[PDB]
Amino acid sequence: PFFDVQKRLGVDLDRWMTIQSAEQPHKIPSRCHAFEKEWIECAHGIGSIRAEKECKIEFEDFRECLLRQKTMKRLHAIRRQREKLIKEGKYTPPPHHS
Amino acid sequence: PGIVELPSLEDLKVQEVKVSSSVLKAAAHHYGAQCDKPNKEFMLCRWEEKDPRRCLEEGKLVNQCALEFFRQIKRHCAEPFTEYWTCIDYSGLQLFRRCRKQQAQFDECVLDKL
Amino acid sequence: MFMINILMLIIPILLAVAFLTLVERKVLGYMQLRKGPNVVGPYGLLQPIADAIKLFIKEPLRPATSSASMFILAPIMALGLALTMWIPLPMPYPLINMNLGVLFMLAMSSLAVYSILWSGWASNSKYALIGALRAVAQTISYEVTLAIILLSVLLMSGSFTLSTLITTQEQMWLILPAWPLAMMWFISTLAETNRAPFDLTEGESELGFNVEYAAGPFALFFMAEYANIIMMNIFTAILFLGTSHNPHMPELYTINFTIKSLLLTMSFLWIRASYPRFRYDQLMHLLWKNFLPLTLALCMWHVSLPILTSGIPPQT
Amino acid sequence: MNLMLALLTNFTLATLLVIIAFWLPQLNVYSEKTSPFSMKFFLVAITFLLFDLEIALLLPLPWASQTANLNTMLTMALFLIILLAVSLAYEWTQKGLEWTE
Amino acid sequence: AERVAAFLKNVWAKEPVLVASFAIAGLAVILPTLSPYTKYSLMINRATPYNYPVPLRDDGNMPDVPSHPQDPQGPSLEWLKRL
Amino acid sequence: MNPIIFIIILLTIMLGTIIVMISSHWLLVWIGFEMNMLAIIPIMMKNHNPRATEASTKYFLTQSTASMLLMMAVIINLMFSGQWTVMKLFNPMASMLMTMALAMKLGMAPFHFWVPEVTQGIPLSSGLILLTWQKLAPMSVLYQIFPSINLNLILTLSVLSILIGGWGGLNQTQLRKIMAYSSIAHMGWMTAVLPYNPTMTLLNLIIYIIMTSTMFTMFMANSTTTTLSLSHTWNKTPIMTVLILATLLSMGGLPPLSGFMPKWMIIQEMTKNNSIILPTFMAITALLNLYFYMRLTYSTTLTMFPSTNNMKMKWQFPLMKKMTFLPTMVVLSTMMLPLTPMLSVLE
Amino acid sequence: MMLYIVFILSVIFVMGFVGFSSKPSPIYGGLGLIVSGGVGCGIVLNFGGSFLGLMVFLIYLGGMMVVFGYTTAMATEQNKAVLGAFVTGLLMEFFMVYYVLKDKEVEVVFEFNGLGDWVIYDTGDSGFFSEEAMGIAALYSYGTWLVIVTGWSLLIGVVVIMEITRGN
Amino acid sequence: MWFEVLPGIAVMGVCLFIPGMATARIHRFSNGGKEKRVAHYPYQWYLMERDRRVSGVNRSYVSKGLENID
Amino acid sequence: MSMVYMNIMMAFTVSLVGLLMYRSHLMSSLLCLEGMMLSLFVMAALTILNSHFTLASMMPIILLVFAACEAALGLSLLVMVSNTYGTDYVQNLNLLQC
């Protein structure tokens, strides 16, 4: 904050909803609780200049759990390959996939 | 990156407990007071390992106790129990308070026989 | 079978609305020392059927509306929403078992104002617009008390599920612990449905918005309006006059629940015959200066009363 | 799917009655017939909107009573309702709820 | 003593609705503080088990944690059965 | 307006700006802005005439649009990082909208066309709030997200503001429009040094507020809103013309007055980063500001313009305006250069 | 075709926006914004948000939009540009739909995918409550600061609007 | 007399009884003589889907008891 | 991102362009302003619900409450503009050029 009144007074005005790995009612976790925790604990205390380089591995995993971009590319590839072999008589789906 | 390791289709096979949710919900209270030890070991495994592949052997033990638990009901208290979960199964919400009369018979039967 | 279920709900609703017109004309007649329809069929049992055929073979006006597309949208929306407000009603088993059914009925009920507003535009008459604005201001004003009163009652129930209100009243009617709220809920339902003593629209000598409609289109507004009168009185009985439900004999619930729903619908006809009409500025003051102060105060009381007695209902 | 069919049936039925209502009498052939902004109304709508929004913050009260912080929850619940009553008092005393010119 | 009676008896005659509204709202703010059962509301809310009671690995020095649900150690809901 | 309601509305303008400065959550930052815009419109409509109504409308549309863009940046930032904390944004597209939303609120060029017109259509006291207080909230957010702001975007908005503020001011006779263009010109300096040393952004902001508040206070004392009406001051309050001369010279950056300190320190923090072309171009373009400031000094203090006969009736009454903190503000606007090293208190 | 209900609703969502964005008469513009609102709730409902979806009907459609239509009928005095904009909007929507349905990958500022929205849903849930409802109910236990600022803003809205509309 | 108003009430009363009576009977017909299952929360839905797999026939309302356990 | 986000993200763009190109009526633009908040409401709710960000489930409601309060303030200005020039045309609001 521009003014750190919350830290000076020790009052939690709006820090309870900043991150999704904080305390949630009934201990309900977010889908990416583990990834957010890992990135936060990696980058804690070392400033954002260093964290952009020394915690890049954790951050990419966190962003993969958020938008799932890499996974959808992989599933998309498999679907195309199966579709290509499907319209050539070269593939046979098993009974439990149909 | 790496390759996700998965157990084999023969490492997951086990004798299932094929009884409807009404049967489970009728025996839930007695079930939890008899199979607590194998149950809690499996749950401690899951909340600590955080990986279902690490607690498969504990999982099979949970299944075996449930199968053995229901066989004892199958031997001594079958008609009282079959008449208990039939009333539970009738309500859309599967309410306990609608079947107090049938619960007492099943509760008393297990007390004497087991 | 679900499609059969929908038709088993829609057609009986329309038939009930058809014969409510007869019953209204005869109860009003006997309270006025006369009879009402007793010539068209035995005891006027064919009067509703004659009225329906007559309207649907009478030429409609359809004036030079500014749009001619709102003129056809307004009755579709009114009748379409009126039938939709019945699908979550437990009688005793809902057609659609919603988790937030009580909130669904508020949401759909607040959309019925558009048919009042759109028909005002379509008429193309400047004066007919003024009548539509007064009706709209009445409806939105009195659904402030519907929302707060409903919230106060649900604090003793624990959920927005409509079938949970049946469980809540398994030992005693909610009319007993919450009769002050029931009074202001009952009057708030009259104002919502433009019923006497709150019918300024139909109250000639001051204005209605559906004046340019005749024949079939007029009957569509009429049918929707009366289906809402039955629906709101069914809602009231569920809310404040809970009927005990025996899972083995569900018909027992339906008979008792129907009798209550009829007695509350006849109360609407009873109140029409007994009182004069409110002035526009006077029904607004009845809401913003009398009901709202009490509704807000009772809401505070009902948020705290369960806590200080250790009587908070279960979430599920 | 069930809720989708229910909505489709009700509005489809209403449309049918409307169109056959505008056409059934037109199967008949009748001879062709031939031939100010108000401020108080606006303030009612705006007062309803601000009151309606405050109701949105009160709807989750039944679930809010299930918490383990009833002292905090009951303090804010009575704060919102008290503030809603303060708005009513301000309009009442400032002649907002009047219909006389 | 006489000023208040004159004031109260006048609003009660001219504005009975407002007099009722403030009395009801005033009780909603006061009684919870003085009510002896407000503490049981929190205990009931804390007793409701939405989540699973994850067990604790045994180290040997935990005499207050039961080894089985039916052991006498641990929190008891006896007070609730009698309330 | 009732006096009590006037205090309540003002405290809500302050509360909105304070919420922005004490919040670690983007939602509360957005709420802070919304509470600020809601409270400031009534003080712009207070005189109840068509021009005020038009000014309040042009302000609402501009600030409403800016707030929607800001909230779009927050949501995009939530999708790509899964958090709400008020810090560097984690998506370049979020940064652009966030940087452009704040630029619209500030009034930087080319999102500047409303500042001359809104400031002209509202009273002097409302303009003082608009040009000084309303600039604190957007600058607080820029102070915090500057590590991720696009350099070419922030420096491009800064250069246009300096130019457009300069040329726009030359063709003005209305005092309210002259300050508006003066406000656009000084914004460019604050955002030009932001990537390099945010401390000098605050110093230039603090000095600008003090100087701008002094000018509006002196205009309000004599109820002057046009260049000509200001030229009668020498015949009514001679002292007030000497104070206007000193402040106008200060705002132009002429040493040894206070207004030279920020221009001095900003040029220092940019040459350390091997930025030589930009500070020179910025400093030379600022001579446009000094010109139309000097024009007011010729028609106010350094020459005696024609007077009117009825002026003699004014000599018999005193000044009953409040003129709050005017003696203290005028001294801080002129005699603070020897205390330049005190800027370290802002670090 | 029922597995792509969310995408179908989103397509109707956009078409409504092109409706009132082209700015026909205010009467029709508000009509198009009601359709988009209803479709907007439909999308939110299918993602698990029931309270949020219904809050759109009660507060947005049955609230604000009624005030918009109410104010239009009383202060609005009941072209090529409209048609040109409307046709331009539909064409861009068609091409965006056409490409994302052909190669199932489109890059416009962001990298969008075309597999289907269902592929990102969570695969595990056995709670005895609604996670959405629990969060909203936390407004009273966790959001003390939020309640105060929101309530004060609503109270100031009443004061400010009466000041603006007095006219004297 | 006043009792000549009743016949209209009976018809209106019967029409409000059919929707309630029909839904109760149709549910039992379609759910093998039991009430339709109520699934408001995810846990109840999980059990119902599990019952679908345990029935053999892909129907949630066909209950398998101890006779299905070895 | 995903397929649904494209249309929600493209609906915000349409409303933004609609708000930046006035035709004649002031009421028309306010609708484009309330269309923008509807798209932001849906886009945020999709993100929060999908990620099981429990405590953020209240954020979309706060977005709706403030955006409607702002809309009310917008309509009030429109009314006061119409009571002066007899219509809500933006071309009338051109006194401040000089």
Ligand SMILES: CCCCCCCCCCCCCCCCCC(=O)OC[C@H](COP(=O)([O-])OCC[N+](C)(C)C)OC(=O)CCCCCCCCCCCCCCCCC
């Ligand atoms: C221990 C804690 C206890 C806490 C709770 C204590 C509660 C104590 C009692 C509080 C008062 C009870 C509230 C009653 C409602 C008062 C509303 C009100 O505003 O009254 C004044 C209002 C108007 O008062 P007024 O017009 O005479 O004057 C108001 C004040 N002055 C004089 C300044 C203007 O009365 C009305 O509502 C008018 C009624 C309109 C016509 C309605 C027809 C009635 C037909 C009979 C229906 C019977 C009910 C059916 C219910 C069936 C339900 C299933």
Ligand SMILES: CCCCCCCCCCCCCCCCCC(=O)OC[C@H](COP(=O)(O)OCCN)OC(=O)CCCCCCCCCCCCCCCCC
């Ligand atoms: C600690 C947490 C709670 C904190 C709550 C604090 C906020 C309270 C919010 C209340 C809602 C806002 C209402 C405020 C307006 C009060 C009424 C008013 O505006 O005054 C108008 C009235 C006009 O006077 P006039 O009409 O000329 O003559 C007759 C008047 N009786 O002038 C008057 O004479 C009215 C007199 C003043 C009204 C006082 C109301 C006091 C209410 C408290 C009662 C509590 C009692 C509870 C105990 C009950 C026990 C049975």
